[PDB]
Amino acid sequence: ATIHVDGKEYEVNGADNLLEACLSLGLDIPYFCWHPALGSVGACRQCAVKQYQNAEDTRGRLVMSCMTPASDGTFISIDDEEAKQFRESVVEWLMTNHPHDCPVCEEGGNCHLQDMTVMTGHSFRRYRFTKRTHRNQDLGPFISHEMNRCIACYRCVRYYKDYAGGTDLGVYGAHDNVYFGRPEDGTLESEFSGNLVEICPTGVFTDKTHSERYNRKWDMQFAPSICQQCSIGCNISPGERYGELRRIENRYNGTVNHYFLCDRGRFGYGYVNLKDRPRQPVQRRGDDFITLNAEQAMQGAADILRQSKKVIGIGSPRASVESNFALRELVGEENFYTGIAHGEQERLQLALKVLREGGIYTPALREIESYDAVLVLGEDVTQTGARVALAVRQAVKGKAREMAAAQKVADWQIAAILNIGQRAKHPLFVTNVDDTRLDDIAAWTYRAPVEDQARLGFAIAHALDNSAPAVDGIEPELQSKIDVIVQALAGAKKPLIISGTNAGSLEVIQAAANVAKALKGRGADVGITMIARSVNSMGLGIMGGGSLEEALTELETGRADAVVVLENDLHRHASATRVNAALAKAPLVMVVDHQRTAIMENAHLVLSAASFAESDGTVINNEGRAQRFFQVYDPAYYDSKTVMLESWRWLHSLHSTLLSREVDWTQLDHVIDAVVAKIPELAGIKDAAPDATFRIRGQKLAREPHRYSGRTAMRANISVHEPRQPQDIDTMFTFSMEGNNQPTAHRSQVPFAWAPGWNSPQAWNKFQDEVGGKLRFGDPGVRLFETSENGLDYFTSVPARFQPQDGKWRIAPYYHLFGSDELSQRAPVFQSRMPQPYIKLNPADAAKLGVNAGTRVSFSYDGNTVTLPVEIAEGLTAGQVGLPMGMSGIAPVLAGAHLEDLKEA
Amino acid sequence: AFELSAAEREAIEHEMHHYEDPRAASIEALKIVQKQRGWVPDGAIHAIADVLGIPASDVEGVATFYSQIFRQPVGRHVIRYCDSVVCHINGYQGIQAALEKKLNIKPGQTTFDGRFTLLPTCCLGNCDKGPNMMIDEDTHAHLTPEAIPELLERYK
Amino acid sequence: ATEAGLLGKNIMGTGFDFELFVHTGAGRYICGEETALINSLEGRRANPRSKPPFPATSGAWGKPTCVNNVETLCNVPAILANGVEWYQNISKSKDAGTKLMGFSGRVKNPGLWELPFGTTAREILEDYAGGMRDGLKFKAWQPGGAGT
Numbered sequence A: 001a002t003i004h005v006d007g008k009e010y011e012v013n014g015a016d017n018l019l020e021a022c023l024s025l026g027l028d029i030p031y032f033c034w035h036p037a038l039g040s041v042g043a044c045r046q047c048a049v050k051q052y053q054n055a056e057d058t059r060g061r062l063v064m065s066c067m068t069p070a071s072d073g074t075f076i077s078i079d080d081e082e083a084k085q086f087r088e089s090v091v092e093w094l095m096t097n098h099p100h101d102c103p104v105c106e107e108g109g110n111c112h113l114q115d116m117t118v119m120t121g122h123s124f125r126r127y128r129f130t131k132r133t134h135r136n137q138d139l140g141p142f143i144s145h146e147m148n149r150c151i152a153c154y155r156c157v158r159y160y161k162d163y164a165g166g167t168d169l170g171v172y173g174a175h176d177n178v179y180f181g182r183p184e185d186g187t188l189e190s191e192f193s194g195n196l197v198e199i200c201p202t203g204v205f206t207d208k209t210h211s212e213r214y215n216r217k218w219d220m221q222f223a224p225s226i227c228q229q230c231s232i233g234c235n236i237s238p239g240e241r242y243g244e245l246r247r248i249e250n251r252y253n254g255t256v257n258h259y260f261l262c263d264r265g266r267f268g269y270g271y272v273n274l275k276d277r278p279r280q281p282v283q284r285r286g287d288d289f290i291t292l293n294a295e296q297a298m299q300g301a302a303d304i305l306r307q308s309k310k311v312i313g314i315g316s317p318r319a320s321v322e323s324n325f326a327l328r329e330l331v332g333e334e335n336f337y338t339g340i341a342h343g344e345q346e347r348l349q350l351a352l353k354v355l356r357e358g359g360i361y362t363p364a365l366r367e368i369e370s371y372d373a374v375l376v377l378g379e380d381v382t383q384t385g386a387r388v389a390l391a392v393r394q395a396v397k398g399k400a401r402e403m404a405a406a407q408k409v410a411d412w413q414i415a416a417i418l419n420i421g422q423r424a425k426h427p428l429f430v431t432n433v434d435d436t437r438l439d440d441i442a443a444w445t446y447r448a449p450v451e452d453q454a455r456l457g458f459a460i461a462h463a464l465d466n467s468a469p470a471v472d473g474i475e476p477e478l479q480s481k482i483d484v485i486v487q488a489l490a491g492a493k494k495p496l497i498i499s500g501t502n503a504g505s506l507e508v509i510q511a512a513a514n515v516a517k518a519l520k521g522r523g524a525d526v527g528i529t530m531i532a533r534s535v536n537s538m539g540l541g542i543m544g545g546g547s548l549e550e551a552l553t554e555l556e557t558g559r560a561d562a563v564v565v566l567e568n569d570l571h572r573h574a575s576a577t578r579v580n581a582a583l584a585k586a587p588l589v590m591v592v593d594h595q596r597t598a599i600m601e602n603a604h605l606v607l608s609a610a611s612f613a614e615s616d617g618t619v620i621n622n623e624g625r626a627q628r629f630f631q632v633y634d635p636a637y638y639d640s641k642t643v644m645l646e647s648w649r650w651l652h653s654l655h656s657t658l659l660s661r662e663v664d665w666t667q668l669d670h671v672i673d674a675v676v677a678k679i680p681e682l683a684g685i686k687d688a689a690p691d692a693t694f695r696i697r698g699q700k701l702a703r704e705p706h707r708y709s710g711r712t713a714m715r716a717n718i719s720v721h722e723p724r725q726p727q728d729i730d731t732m733f734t735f736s737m738e739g740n741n742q743p744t745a746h747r748s749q750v751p752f753a754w755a756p757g758w759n760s761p762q763a764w765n766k767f768q769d770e771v772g773g774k775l776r777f778g779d780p781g782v783r784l785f786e787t788s789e790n791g792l793d794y795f796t797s798v799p800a801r802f803q804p805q806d807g808k809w810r811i812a813p814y815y816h817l818f819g820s821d822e823l824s825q826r827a828p829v830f831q832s833r834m835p836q837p838y839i840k841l842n843p844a845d846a847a848k849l850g851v852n853a854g855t856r857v858s859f860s861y862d863g864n865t866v867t868l869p870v871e872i873a874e875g876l877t878a879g880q881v882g883l884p885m886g887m888s889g890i891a892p893v894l895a896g897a898h899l900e901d902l903k904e905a
Numbered sequence B: 001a002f003e004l005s006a007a008e009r010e011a012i013e014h015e016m017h018h019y020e021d022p023r024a025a026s027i028e029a030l031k032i033v034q035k036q037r038g039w040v041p042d043g044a045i046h047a048i049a050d051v052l053g054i055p056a057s058d059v060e061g062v063a064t065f066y067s068q069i070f071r072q073p074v075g076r077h078v079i080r081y082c083d084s085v086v087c088h089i090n091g092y093q094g095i096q097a098a099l100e101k102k103l104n105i106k107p108g109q110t111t112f113d114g115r116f117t118l119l120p121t122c123c124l125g126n127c128d129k130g131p132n133m134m135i136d137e138d139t140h141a142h143l144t145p146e147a148i149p150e151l152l153e154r155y156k
Numbered sequence C: 001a002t003e004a005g006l007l008g009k010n011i012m013g014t015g016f017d018f019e020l021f022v023h024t025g026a027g028r029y030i031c032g033e034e035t036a037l038i039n040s041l042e043g044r045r046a047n048p049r050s051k052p053p054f055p056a057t058s059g060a061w062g063k064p065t066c067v068n069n070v071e072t073l074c075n076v077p078a079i080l081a082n083g084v085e086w087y088q089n090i091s092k093s094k095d096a097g098t099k100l101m102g103f104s105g106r107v108k109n110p111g112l113w114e115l116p117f118g119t120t121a122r123e124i125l126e127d128y129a130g131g132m133r134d135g136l137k138f139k140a141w142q143p144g145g146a147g148t
């Protein structure tokens, strides 16, 4: 398609509207109510241009560039006098009721309305009358509400209802008294409600967790990082001021997590700012806790490790690839144990075998939205992999998208698309032990135990392909539902099967693999997605090693007299009493961690490791994509006594001091090269990000904006002399503003989006090749493995049906986005959002036990009696008791286990 | 504490029988609740949402959008006087002044004993017989300020 | 009409089935806009819709929908009963048929009459509405309501 903007010819896409096409060309058109992820509605009337019928036309007519397709031979003008006057008039009309609030507004300096007021050239007020006002609502602990600043652009309601699928936010009222919020005061119930702080172009919805310790955008030190709160691996921009992690912003990755994060990643960063974190190496000597610096810590640790007869290392899926590899090199490959349980490791290795050996393509997070039917087996996606649930919602709305496409309606005209596809949607079949948050859009939901969900998957795979093993004992109603699922999956051009290791069942993963293989054998374009547990679960599975139980037996038998635990609390993967006894028996325990865990009391040496905000490294997400996260700030810049290093730095220096009695720390690229050389399965992490010698025309990449302030006063209370700027020898970024952050710079890692005239998160449009697409020079991250040429065989281990045995209670896992993650519960802002710890019971089981809803019952697990209140779960199958996984005192390894003497306290 | 009555619920289901989408009975469900109880209370939004299977935010937005669905308590009789252009030509301001003198309240307010609620309203489609007033179900035309307190005494 | 067989199932034995309902509104002026009318019919807020697509292609609940005024549908049966040649010979003007016209506001006879198109506004004011009232002189007029 050929367009002519202000007499200049451009080649665009005819399927795009004029606004996104002109923004992709670098032209500036003001806009409020259009979003690339949400489509065009024509509400704010800000994107007006002047369209001409032909080339020799002078009058023209004001059209809206978001509502006008960028067809071939189009003639428009942006800098026309009438279009400029109308855009300034629209800004003026929006400014008639706006409060004089910019100094006391958290959106100041980050405001789209500020940028568009300046861009339209409106700086003189002639409106002399009153301004309308609105009371505010309490929207919970994460979102702060201020309705006076609203411009009625309907972005919040469109995102929250059409895109996110939420129900409790809406628009109320009339002509100029439109109110946007909840019908009553209460917490916003959506798991993706935190994206409202970037969706809203004004300061109506603001980050309250950031608003506590608020600082402006220009004062932030930003980094490109990966969110560590689950396995999806969404790209984030952590921003820091005065030595504390101030905010998490969404970093655009067109392949993974383009515009949106979930609430756990956006608000669960508060564990970094905890005051109980280790900041210096501490050595235990009797009842004394001697604080050392790094050199004598390495010397002492080297002597005690050299005096030991066998040293073992227990890793974690929390730690990066480099840190786990450094521990594995320090203790040896045969003495390296993964920090997860045997069942967790078996499920994770089976998921990895399915992903990189099953011959079925694993889609990216953005690619999930283009699938025609979704079957979720066992995995509570909204509570474990929430962004996959959001992409599943988009894939479900794909049917309305294609129905509107069949009527020659453009893909950006979202209102007509939703009008045509009223309630028709792509098939979604979710299985769980109880209700999920995807039940409102699911074609079917199966509330059953994990054995029954696995049997349903095996029956689906057998009905799709008769070479798969059959299931005997299917009820006719269950057979009818299986036939419905099979008829939906067989007629889908792009079926998608989503499972994971959080269900606590190997057979669920086997059934999902069988369904994917049966769909692949029919020639369908089937994709499979496995949801892991932690941020680097896939990387720890690829690296491999023994389980935690083998390490505990090695400690208990006396064969290992020294244990090095890397960033693992060890209570989430095994029983606490066994771990405590095995660690107390060992004469040397060294815990390398950034959080104050419970096993540090028995630890002889504690190494103050760095979190993701203070370290660089590589993490492998659930799809096998290696992603590099970069250090945000130097911990020792403010507190000069703080000795907090990277975990791989700690362990590599320890290995060097053990081998040659000299302290060499590392460079990060050396550890990357060591990983690539020693582990050929992790050889793709070299190309995840360029090395520390990468420059943009000779200069580094800036972590903080060019208008960063306070440089001669941030440390003036400690010392009036300005200290040395922190040097970054590990990566290509610099701890200063003397770098490159141009939108046209040839790079893939963007610490933050800023353009002249675009201070809001809309500068990502300037940082993309086309608006709403990918990054201009490719998205960061590289897939570790390609799709295999040949697949697996059918798993013939069909489990027997769930039999409720008397006196034993099967623990059904319940996951919560706020509470199940290990580090997110440590964030103090989560405790208001974290649920109370209950236990779920069937009505029949509660009536048999004589217990009501809310009464306290006590159960003993591994000789430990604990009491919890009771809810009555209607969808939970009898013979099962429902436990919330990852909570205080409930380890995630309890999923799929059994319970004894569960009785009323 | 709100609970929908049996007659209200059955009328609501009979209203959703008329459409291919149960959402389309939200306006008439709110009108049924308003006719039964004078106005639409806070729990009525959640009750109508639970019956209709739509979120309560959409029901609240519909109830706050439409002027004839009252989300605040009103009196036993609602006076609605036309203030549009033809009745402005015919002099609705004398009628409004007589109403404010007799009821001792401003428009949008309720009498202290809860008998009358005075409200302006748009054109009633009776411009040839203006000015017009609309009490609860009856429209009165050819109004004069002298006939206002005589007319108001027949609504006990 | 339902009792007489004019509505419902098998109207006049011809196999055509038609069901007619009355949707009483909740008092908002914007609901008269046809796309806002469709949105209000669906139980939503009466925000209008952008056209294209027009309601003929995708209107009420995504289905083909035609919205017409009361007076157009009242003009339809006269056309179907008396014919096209009668309807085109009502008036010698570009706009065929009759129209409900009338004058309102401090005139002698504020009312409503049915006149052919091409009837000048002075005949409506003076020959039908009787002109202005006593002691009042004509200043201005709006031809077609408050929006003209």
Ligand SMILES: Cc1cc2nc3c(=O)[nH]c(=O)nc-3n(C[C@H](O)[C@H](O)[C@H](O)COP(=O)(O)O)c2cc1C
Pocket: C029, C030, C031, C032, C033, C034, C035, C067, C068, C069, C070, C072
């Ligand atoms: C703001 C607005 C209000 C309208 N209100 C009405 C109305 O109350 N009644 C009506 O018949 N048409 C109304 N219309 C016109 C309709 O859009 C549409 O023309 C009409 O319903 C059907 O067209 P017809 O004249 O061919 O029958 C309104 C239009 C607008 C823009």
Ligand code: SF4
Pocket: A098, A099, A100, A101, A102, A105, A106, A107, A108, A109, A111, A112, A113, A114, A149, A201, A202, A203, A204
């Ligand atoms: S929302 Fe923007 S324009 Fe409004 S007060 Fe805040 S910074 Fe100023």
Ligand code: SF4
Pocket: A149, A150, A151, A152, A153, A154, A155, A156, A157, A180, A199, A200, A201, A202, A204, A205
């Ligand atoms: S609250 Fe924000 S996103 Fe919602 S309509 Fe107002 S300005 Fe737009």
Ligand code: SF4
Pocket: A227, A228, A229, A230, A231, A232, A233, A234, A261, A262, A263, A264, A265, A266, A385, A386, A387, A388
């Ligand atoms: S989905 Fe997972 S990786 Fe993404 S923001 Fe949420 S917790 Fe972080």
Ligand code: FES
Pocket: A019, A030, A031, A032, A033, A034, A041, A042, A043, A044, A045, A046, A047, A048, A064, A065, A066, A067
């Ligand atoms: S962006 Fe086009 S009218 Fe709002």
Ligand code: FES
Pocket: B082, B083, B084, B085, B086, B087, B088, B122, B123, B124, B125, B126, B127, B130, B131, B132
């Ligand atoms: S202007 Fe008052 S009834 Fe029409």
Ligand SMILES: [Ca+2]
Pocket: A615, A616, A631, A728, A729, A730, A731
């Ligand atoms: Ca570093």
